[PDB]
Amino acid sequence: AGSRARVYAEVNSLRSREYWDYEAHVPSWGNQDDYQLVRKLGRGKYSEVFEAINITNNERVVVKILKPVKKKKIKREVKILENLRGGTNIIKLIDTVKDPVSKTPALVFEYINNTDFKQLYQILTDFDIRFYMYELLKALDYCHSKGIMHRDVKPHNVMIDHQQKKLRLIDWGLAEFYHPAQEYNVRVASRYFKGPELLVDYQMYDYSLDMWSLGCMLASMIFRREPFFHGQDNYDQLVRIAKVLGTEELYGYLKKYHIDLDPHFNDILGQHSRKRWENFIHSENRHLVSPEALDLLDKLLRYDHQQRLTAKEAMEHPYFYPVVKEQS
Ligand SMILES: O=C(O)c1ccc2c(c1)nc(Nc1cccc(Cl)c1)c1ccncc12
Numbered sequence: 001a002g003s004r005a006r007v008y009a010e011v012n013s014l015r016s017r018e019y020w021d022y023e024a025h026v027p028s029w030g031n032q033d034d035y036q037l038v039r040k041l042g043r044g045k046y047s048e049v050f051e052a053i054n055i056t057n058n059e060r061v062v063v064k065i066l067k068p069v070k071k072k073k074i075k076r077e078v079k080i081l082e083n084l085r086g087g088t089n090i091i092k093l094i095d096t097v098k099d100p101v102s103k104t105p106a107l108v109f110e111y112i113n114n115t116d117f118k119q120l121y122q123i124l125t126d127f128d129i130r131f132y133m134y135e136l137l138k139a140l141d142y143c144h145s146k147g148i149m150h151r152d153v154k155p156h157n158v159m160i161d162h163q164q165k166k167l168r169l170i171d172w173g174l175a176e177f178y179h180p181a182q183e184y185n186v187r188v189a190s191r192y193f194k195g196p197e198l199l200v201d202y203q204m205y206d207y208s209l210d211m212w213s214l215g216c217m218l219a220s221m222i223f224r225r226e227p228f229f230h231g232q233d234n235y236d237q238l239v240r241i242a243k244v245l246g247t248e249e250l251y252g253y254l255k256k257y258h259i260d261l262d263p264h265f266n267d268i269l270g271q272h273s274r275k276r277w278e279n280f281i282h283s284e285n286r287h288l289v290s291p292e293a294l295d296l297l298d299k300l301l302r303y304d305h306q307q308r309l310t311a312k313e314a315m316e317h318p319y320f321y322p323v324v325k326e327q328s
């Protein structure tokens, strides 16, 4: 009874229990032998990702092989992906398969030819940033409307093919279902994308965590400082935030939600004024910054998770009017 979402708060409560009760979900496991692995793309803590071909139809896909011990978490990710089926700009789950002998499970996703913007293709224009942020917002509004927090929004999870102008939000392995008053694990998101709520151990968070992470991505893109808040550890991460947003404002947020700060922060936070967003503008980024962009960013990167724009409210912001007009 400390906090709840401003939007879609009851939306899982209003659905059949089977929608959100992922522990009860019984996936249909197809045959992984239909997929030929071509190339290893990477590895995470509990998964590895390969480029592959479906040999029955010659389609290129990716296969994400799951360490099989984590049964509840597998069911969670599978059920979330099935619920998100057809959602705008959400990576498409094509199948759920197992090796028919070992029974190791794997997820088959559509392939996206991800651009490395760090050199190869094109450095983003103002319009490009608006466009891709708007497309990312569609995916977040969709999943939030579906009662799902992603909880790991960061650039690596936002796959963009800059030649075809396609965007997909990937890696739903940390995603959860939002339920009013539920206390969630704060050990989610990449350090640089963690909202203050996580950093101060506030467990009654909601979809608005994803809006912090998308604000961090907006800042990094318009100002060309990636990641925007570069902490060396979780404590330093909050200090990096406070050096921008201010310490008095942090204390107001803590008092509103009755939050206790870990006392180790006493030795490191200092005293910081709230900075003007215009302080980040210089010759290398001025062509990406506008009054609109700053107004939007200022409404995303707020301590108080309840005062951040929703995905929809962000979509509706003037910053995206040029994109809306072009999509007409
Ligand atoms: O987890 C998912 O939902 C997930 C879903 C789809 C992709 C993915 C992860 N990772 C990819 N690439 C990648 C690149 C570097 C490291 C790692 Cl582990 C993976 C990738 C590439 C091309 N098309 C789709 C994907």
Ligand SMILES: NCCc1ccc(Cl)c(Cl)c1
Residues within 6 Å of the ligand: 117, 124, 128, 129, 130, 132, 133, 136, 154, 155, 156, 157, 158, 159, 160, 217, 221
């Ligand atoms: N992997 C691409 C991450 C990225 C880069 C630029 C933008 Cl504007 C966005 Cl939304 C996402």
